[PDB]
C-alpha cells in the first residue's frame, strides 16, 4: 500500500474535499465542522486518538462517486461505518475506529438519557435518529454503558453537536498531518 505519509496525504485530500458538503446548511460545511471538533478535543486535553477520532468522525458521508469509491462506502452507506472501516483498512487503531463508529450510538444514548438533548440536534441528526432505532431503551443503555469507550464516545458526540460555531478560527487539516503519521507508525 501507500507509505504512511501518503496515506495521510490521501486523508487530507478527502478532508479538503468534504468542504463541499453542507453540515449546518451552507454556513458550516463538513470540513469546518470536523476541524472544530478536532480543536475541541485537542484543547480539552484529549489524547491524540480522541483528537483524530474527532477530526475524522464524519469522513464517511457520501461526497461524490470518486471519494466514495476511494473509501469503499458502496453497500455500507452508514457514514460512521464507512469512515471507521476505511480508517481500519489504512492502519488506524481499533480505538479510533470504534470512537468513530460509535458516534451514532452515542447520540441515541444521550437523547435517551436526557430528552432535552434532542433540542441540541441538527435537522439531519434529528431525522436520522428515526432510522437508527430511535432513542435507546434501558437495556440498550446498559450495554452501551459497559463499552470500554463509553464516556469517550459521549465526549466525541458532545463535541460533535458543538461543532457549529460561526466565528471560530481553528487549524486546518495539515495541522494534524504529523499526528496522523505518528498514529499510523505507532500502529504498524
Ligand atoms: Fe456524524
Ligand atoms: Fe459530526
Curated annotation (Swiss-Prot):
Binding residues for Fe cation 1: 23, 33, 57-58, 160
Residues holding (1R)-(2-amino-1-hydroxyethyl)phosphonate: 26, 61, 107, 125-132, 157
Residues involved in Fe cation 2 binding: 58, 79, 103
Effect of residue 23 to E: Slight decrease of the catalytic efficiency and of the affinity for (R)-2-amino-1-hydroxyethylphosphonic acid
SUPFAM superfamilies xrefs: HD-domain/PDEase-like (SSF109604)
Known cofactor(s): Fe cation
Stated consequence of mutating residue 23 to F: Slight decrease of the catalytic efficiency and of the affinity for (R)-2-amino-1-hydroxyethylphosphonic acid. 3-fold decrease of the Fe-enzyme molar ratios
Keywords tagged on the record: Hydrolase, Iron, Metal-binding, Oxidoreductase
Effect of residue 26 to A: 4-fold decrease of the catalytic efficiency and 3-fold decrease of the affinity for (R)-2-amino-1-hydroxyethylphosphonic acid. 6-fold decrease of the Fe-enzyme molar ratios
Site feature (Important for stereospecificity with the R-enantiomer) residues: 26
Cofactor note: Binds 2 iron ions per subunit. During catalysis, PhnZ uses a mixed-valent Fe(2+)/Fe(3+) cofactor.
Enzyme Commission designation: 1.13.11.78
Record note on what altering residue 160 to A does: Loss of dioxygenase activity
Reaction(s) catalysed by this chain's protein: (1R)-(2-amino-1-hydroxyethyl)phosphonate + O2 = glycine + phosphate + 2 H(+)
Domain of life: Bacteria
Function recorded in the entry: Involved in the degradation of the organophosphonate 2-aminoethylphosphonic acid (2-AEP). Catalyzes the cleavage of the carbon-phosphorus bond of (2-amino-1-hydroxyethyl)phosphonic acid to yield glycine and phosphate through an oxidative mechanism. It reacts stereospecifically with the R-enantiomer of (2-amino-1-hydroxyethyl)phosphonic acid and is also able to use (R,R)-2-amino-1-hydroxypropylphosphonate as substrate.
Protein name: 2-amino-1-hydroxyethylphosphonate dioxygenase (glycine-forming)
Record organism: Uncultured bacterium HF130_AEPn_1
Gene that encodes the chain: phnZ
